[PDB]
Amino acid sequence: SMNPPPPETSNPNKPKRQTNQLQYLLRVVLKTLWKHQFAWPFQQPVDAVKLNLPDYYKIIKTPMDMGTIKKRLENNYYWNAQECIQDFNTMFTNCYIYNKPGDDIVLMAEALEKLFLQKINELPTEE
Ligand SMILES: CN1Cc2cc(S(=O)(=O)Nc3ccccc3)ccc2NC1=O
């Protein structure tokens, strides 16, 4: 009954960068999703322990969540936007894999993903 360590949000050996696309991701894409009524289950790592999902981390080996993404953005963890996009996709995909296609949690992930795809559609060209 332990959770894994969470995904890293800082790394002294990983080069860091600011891009206009990373700024958009924090200021428009994450901001839009974070304040959405369906954000809250996704605002922190899945706590398999407190939520009583004991097989969660047997099935999901690449956990991701918006809490993690927010810190990564804030900490300038990423070098490029594509890394951050891949984190959002990982988070959605994990939800779709672990849960049944009927579940409330899946319908929420889907609505957030739709809005995410709407916001990254207008991702500005880099400077
Ligand atoms: C991202 N999550 C997190 C998660 C949280 C929970 S919950 O027990 O809070 N129940 C709950 C909460 C909100 C909406 C619907 C159900 C259950 C399952 C999951 N599965 C996931 O995949």
Swiss-Prot record:
Tissue and organ expression note: Ubiquitously expressed.
Impact reported for N99A: Abolishes binding to acetylated histones
Entry comment on modification after translation: Phosphorylation by CK2 disrupt the intramolecular binding between the bromo domain 2 and the NPS region and promotes binding between the NPS and the BID regions, leading to activate the protein and promote binding to acetylated histones. In absence of phosphorylation, BRD4 does not localize to p53/TP53 target gene promoters, phosphorylation promoting recruitment to p53/TP53 target promoters.
Compartment(s) of residence: Nucleus; Chromosome
Annotated site residue numbers, Acetylated histone binding: N99
Cross-link (Glycyl lysine isopeptide (Lys-Gly) (interchain with G-Cter in SUMO2)): K58
Domain Bromo: 17-123
Superkingdom of the source species: Eukaryota
Summary of subunit composition and partner proteins: Interacts with p53/TP53; the interaction is direct. Interacts (via CTD region) with CDK9 and CCNT1, acting as an associated component of P-TEFb complex. Interacts with RELA (when acetylated at 'Lys-310'). Interacts (via NET domain) with NSD3, CHD4, BICRA and ATAD5. The interaction with BICRA bridges BRD4 to the GBAF complex. Interacts (via NET domain) with JMJD6 (via JmjC and N-terminal domains); the interaction is stronger in presence of ssRNA and recruits JMJD6 on distal enhancers. Interacts with NSD3. Interacts with NIPBL. (Microbial infection) Interacts with bovine papillomavirus type 1 regulatory protein E2. This interactions may serve for the tethering of viral genomes to host mitotic chromosomes allowing successful partitioning of the viral genome during cell division.
Purpose of the protein: Chromatin reader protein that recognizes and binds acetylated histones and plays a key role in transmission of epigenetic memory across cell divisions and transcription regulation. Remains associated with acetylated chromatin throughout the entire cell cycle and provides epigenetic memory for postmitotic G1 gene transcription by preserving acetylated chromatin status and maintaining high-order chromatin structure. During interphase, plays a key role in regulating the transcription of signal-inducible genes by associating with the P-TEFb complex and recruiting it to promoters.
Family: Belongs to the BET family.
Domain notes: The NET domain mediates interaction with a number of chromatin proteins involved in transcription regulation (NSD3, JMJD6, CHD4, GLTSCR1 and ATAD5).
Miscellaneous comment as given in the Swiss-Prot or TrEMBL entry: JQ1, a thieno-triazolo-1,4-diazepine derivative, and I-BET, a benzodiazepine derivative, have been tested on tumors with success. Treatment with GSK1210151A (I-BET151, a I-BET derivative) has strong effets on mixed lineage leukemia and promotes myeloid differentiation and leukemia stem-cell depletion.
Disease implication from the record: Cornelia de Lange syndrome 6: A form of Cornelia de Lange syndrome, a clinically heterogeneous developmental disorder associated with malformations affecting multiple systems. It is characterized by facial dysmorphisms, abnormal hands and feet, growth delay, cognitive retardation, hirsutism, gastroesophageal dysfunction and cardiac, ophthalmologic and genitourinary anomalies. CDLS6 inheritance is autosomal dominant. A chromosomal aberration involving BRD4 is found in a rare, aggressive, and lethal carcinoma arising in midline organs of young people. Translocation t(15;19)(q14;p13) with NUTM1 which produces a BRD4-NUTM1 fusion protein.
Protein name: Bromodomain-containing protein 4
Organism, as annotated: Homo sapiens (Human)
Interval of the full protein contained in this chain: 42 to 168 of 1362
